[PDB]
């Protein structure tokens, strides 16, 4: 969910005819090591998922500082 300081988000409370285009990307999994007390250290390495665009809607980001009306 994305929010911006542009005029398109300043008073976004009601939205219609919402449409979007998004190009796919790839999220590749990195290496995470486990701090075992003794012996060899296992590592979780690899793992990739290609993200492809799907339907867009309206959401709200609720953080400790700002409550934002986002897409």
């Amino acid at each position: 969910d994305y929010w911006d300081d542009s005029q398109a988000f300043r008073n976004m409370v009601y939205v219609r005819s919402l449409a979007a285009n998004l190009n796919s990307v790839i999220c590749t999994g990195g290496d995470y090591s486990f701090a075992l007390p003794v012996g060899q250290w296992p590592v979780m390495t690899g793992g990739a998922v290609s993200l492809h665009s799907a339907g867009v809607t309206l959401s709200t980001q609720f953080t400790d500082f700002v409550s934002l009306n986002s897409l």
């Binding site: 005819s17 449409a19 979007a20 285009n21 998004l22 190009n23 796919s24 665009s53």
Partner: protein
Amino acid sequence: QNYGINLPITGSMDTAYANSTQEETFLTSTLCLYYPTEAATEINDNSWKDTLSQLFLTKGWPTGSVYFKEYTDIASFSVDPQLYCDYNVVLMKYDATLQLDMSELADLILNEWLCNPMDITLYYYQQTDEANKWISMGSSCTIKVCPLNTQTLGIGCLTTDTATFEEVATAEKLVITDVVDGVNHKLDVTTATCTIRNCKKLGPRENVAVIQVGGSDVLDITADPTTAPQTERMMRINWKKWWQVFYTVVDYVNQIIQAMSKRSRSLNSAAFYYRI
């Protein structure tokens, strides 16, 4: 002149013809012969320009009137062609694989064009009229077109993913794109190498005549499929040696110029009139 452009001109249908102005036209005009580099290579002579000038003088052109400009090939010459003098004769070598490129060069140099900048990275563009086209030229043009809907998103192409755009040109030194009128298009162009302009065809160009050396009638200077006009300035000849071609051009220079008209030359040699 200009204030009286929108005024009638009346003429009697019995006014005596004036004498031939061909001699005066030659004495006060300059002629350009654009030929491919392979022509000079095959001729294999370093004084052939002087011989051609002397032959033209035998044909009435004063020494200094005729000029010779060399271009590597159709693809290179199509990158912002420059038409320098009053009468331009372009000797275009025919290749069956480059029919569209020959047609595009002929369209560019045989017609007047009124071009404007296209900031494809900021605005999406339309072709309002049948005369409106998109002429792009440079080192290498690759134009990808994404038609857009009322929401300004893409139709059959993601507005962001250029891989889903529609390819109309690839590594082209010149291309004249014609998309459906009235539809906004997002354009992805290799702006680093070549420039694209929104152009309007104003009318014919009388000072430029293209002689197609070999081949058949393949030029189509109009995007309309129903029309493939063969104007008087689009000549075609059959060749085995370039010296014969040049002798034919010199001998029938009167006929070639007759197919061309004066006053069509512009101060600048550019192939279009640029507005920004």
